[PDB]
Amino acid sequence: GQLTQSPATLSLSPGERATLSCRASQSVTNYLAWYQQKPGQAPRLLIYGASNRATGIPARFSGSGSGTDFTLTISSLEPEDFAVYYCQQRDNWPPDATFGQGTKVEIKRTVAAPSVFIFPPSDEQLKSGTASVVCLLNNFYPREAKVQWKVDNALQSGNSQESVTEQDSKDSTYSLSSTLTLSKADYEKHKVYACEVTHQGLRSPVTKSFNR
Amino acid sequence: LINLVESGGGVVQPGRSLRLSCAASGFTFSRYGMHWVRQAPGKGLEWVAVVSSDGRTTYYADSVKGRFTISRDNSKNTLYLQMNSLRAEDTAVFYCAKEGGDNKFSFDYWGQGTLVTVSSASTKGPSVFPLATAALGCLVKDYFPEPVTVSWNSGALTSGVHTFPAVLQSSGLYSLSSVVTVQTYTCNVDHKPSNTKVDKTVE
Ligand SMILES: C[C@@H]1O[C@@H](O)[C@H](O)[C@H](O)[C@H]1O
Numbered sequence: 434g435q436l437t438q439s440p441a442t443l444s445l446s447p448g449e450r451a452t453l454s455c456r457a458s459q460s461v462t463n464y465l466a467w468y469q470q471k472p473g474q475a476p477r478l479l480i481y482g483a484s485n486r487a488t489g490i491p492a493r494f495s496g497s498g499s500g501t502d503f504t505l506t507i508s509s510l511e512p513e514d515f516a517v518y519y520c521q522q523r524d525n526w527p528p529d530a531t532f533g534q535g536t537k538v539e540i541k542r543t544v545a546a547p548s549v550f551i552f553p554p555s556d557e558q559l560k561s562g563t564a565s566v567v568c569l570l571n572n573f574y575p576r577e578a579k580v581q582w583k584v585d586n587a588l589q590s591g592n593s594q595e596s597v598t599e600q601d602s603k604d605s606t607y608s609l610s611s612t613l614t615l616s617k618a619d620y621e622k623h624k625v626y627a628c629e630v631t632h633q634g635l636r637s638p639v640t641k642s643f644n645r
Numbered sequence: 646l647i648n649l650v651e652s653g654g655g656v657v658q659p660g661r662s663l664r665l666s667c668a669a670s671g672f673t674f675s676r677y678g679m680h681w682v683r684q685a686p687g688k689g690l691e692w693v694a695v696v697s698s699d700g701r702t703t704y705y706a707d708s709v710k711g712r713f714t715i716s717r718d719n720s721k722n723t724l725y726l727q728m729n730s731l732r733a734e735d736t737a738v739f740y741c742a743k744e745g746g747d748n749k750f751s752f753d754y755w756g757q758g759t760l761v762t763v764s765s766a767s768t769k770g771p772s773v774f775p776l777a778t779a780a781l782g783c784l785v786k787d788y789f790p791e792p793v794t795v796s797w798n799s800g801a802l803t804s805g806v807h808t809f810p811a812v813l814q815s816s817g818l819y820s821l822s823s824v825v826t827v828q829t830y831t832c833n834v835d836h837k838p839s840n841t842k843v844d845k846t847v848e
Contacts, residue, residue, distance in 0.1 A: 466751035468690075475740055475758055476690060481751035488753070519690055523750040528704045530680065530692040530752075548826070550780040558774045558784070565784055567776055569824055571807070596809040596821065608807040610822045612784075614814070 434458055436465075436520050438533035444541040444575065451507040453536045455520030458501070465503045467496055468519045470535075472599065476519065480505065507538075515540050515600070539576070542605040546634025547573035551627075551641040554620065564620035566613040568628035568641070572606040579631040580611040585623045589613060620645070647671035647754045649741055654759030656790045657731055661763075665726040667741030667756045674722035675699070678744045680752065681715060681726050683761075685737040686813070693739070694726065709735075731763045762790055766817035770841030773834050781847050782824030783832035787816070793836040795823040802830070 435458040445451055455465060464483030468476040478487040480496040483503055493508040507514055520533040547570035554564040570578055576597075582589035595611040611628065627642035653665035667679070681693040694705045694715040703715050714727040724741050739759050742752035771788035775781075785793055795808045808823040823832055831846040 463748075463750040466745075466748070468752075470690075475755040476752075477755070478745070478751060478753050481745055481748040481753070485747065487747075487751075521690075521751065525750075528678070528695050529706065530682070530695075530750075532690040532692065535689045548778060548780075550824075552776040552782075552784075555774045555777070555784075558772075558786075561772065561774075565774070565786065565820075567784065567822060569780060569782075569822075571780065571824075571826060594812045594814070596812050598807050598809055608809075608824075610809050610824070612812070612820070612822070 434522075434531055436522055436531055436533035438520055438536050440536065441534075442537045442539055442576075444539045445510055446541045447510045447512055449510055451510055451514070451538055453505045453518050453520075453538075455498075455503045455505070455533045456501055457503075457522060460500050461522050462524055463522070465496075465498065466521045467505045468521060469514075469516050470519065471516045479518075510538070514538060540600055540605045542574050544634045545572060545574045545604075545606055547571055547578060547609075547630060547632055549628065549630050549639050549641045551643060553626065553643050553645070559617055559620070562617050564615045564617050566615070566620075566626050566628075568611045568613070568630075570609045570611075570630055570632075572601070572604065572608055573632055573634060574606045575633060576607050577633070578607075578609060580609070581629040581631075582611070582613045583625075583627045583629065584615075585625050647743075649743065649754055649756040651739070651741055651756035651759040653726075654739065654761050656762040656764065658765050659732055659763055661731055662727070662729040663731060663761060664728065665739055665741075665759055665761075667724040669722045669724065669743070672743075672746070674717075675719040677746075678749070679717060679724040680742045680744070681724075681739060682742050682752070683737040683739045684758075685734075688737070691737075696724065728761070731761075733763050733765070735761060736763045737761060764789070764817050766790075768838050769818065770836050770839035771820075771834065771843075773832065773843045773845045775845065775847040776822065776824060777847055778826050780824055780826045781830060782822055783834065783845055783847060784820070784822050785832075785834050785836075786820045787814070787818040788820070788836050788839070788841075789818050790838055791819055793819075793821065793834060795821075796833045797823070797825055798829070798831055799833055
């Protein structure tokens with residue numbers, strides 16, 4: 434009815450052991466199943482009946498549990514194992530299936546502060562009648578990073594969206610962009626546009642700004 | 646040996662209908678209950694509906710009751726999902742899944758997924774604006790529907806390039822940035838749904 438998975442994210446290096454857990458709100462009559470899912474691909478059955486490996490699933494994958502506690506274990510991580518894992522439950526009746534919210538297994542790596550850049554809206558876009566201010570955080574690790582927009586010292590809330598790349602195939606870092614949207618009219622009403630970034634690799638927040 | 650192939654997805658406006666198909670092969674279709682499971686953008690897996698092996702009993706997630714109808718045709722080994730009165734919130738990738746042979750409370754085989762996009766937005770090509778160790782890029786803004794592809798210098802520049810995942814803006818149109826950290830730099834943008842190609846040299 435409710436499957437709670439933990440942790441939400443697991444940062445490991447290839448060769449280490451991964452332990453994911455899933456907890457049901459009530460004793461499940463049927464042992465859980467586990468799935469692996471890579472971005473933009475169908476889920477793949479790994480374990481069913483709490484401990485049985487599905488077809489073609491290698492030995493390093495194992496599971497156990499009973500009652501309300503189930504766990505998935507990957508004895509030694511291989512590069513292809515970094516993905517998202519879901520636990521799943523289903524009764525005979527009602528027949529609906531329930532899914533955990535997923536655990537993301539990510540590649541650990543040394544700390545790397547982001548290189549920050551700010552881009553003012555292009556004159557070309559301003560003709561268009563819109564303004565997009567872009568803040569880029571390049572090649573950082575770990576994932577958690579906080580971006581804060583300020584226009585003439587006023588904290589911007591609800592008018593920005595951000596996007597993050599997948600862990601880089603080569604250096605395992607992330608890159609993120611935050612886009613602040615403003616009407617051209619308002620853009621022209623202010624002077625200082627600033628992007629303040631807070632991250633582990635930075636001893637104190639970094640701010641990039643420009644003057645309209 | 647076992648295979649599930651889907652089709653039927655598409656971009657549609659709210660209130661319209663769509664009908665999904667999932668053709669099975671490699672196993673005795675008539676013996677398994679079949680299901681539809683979806684995954685909205687950036688979300689986890691969410692169960693939608695089930696139809697018993699003989700097609701007589703069905704069950705639906707509360708969010709789709711009265712709007713969607715799951716059915717199957719065993720003669721043709723096909724599973725269907727009739728989706729009426731579509732809403733923007735239905736937007737997601739829809740997968741069909743087969744109840745396990747070894748364990749029926751698990752899903753042993755899945756369709757590759759079919760995309761259901763519900764939006765009152767219309768097809769539109771993007772506008773490409775310049776974003777000017779240094780960094781530069783292209784802001785590929787206000788297009789619909791997904792996807793658009795971006796490459797740099799006709800694919801001759803790849804090192805140090807980051808093309809971010811698209812973002813759905815409040816206007817219903819998508820937007821994405823492609824940057825590169827570093828001689829001429831041109832982003833080659835292509836949005837097939839609108840037959841829109843643009844080579845934008847960033848100065
Ligand atoms: C719809 C049908 O309902 C019950 O008979 C079982 O849960 C079966 O697995 C399912 O397919």
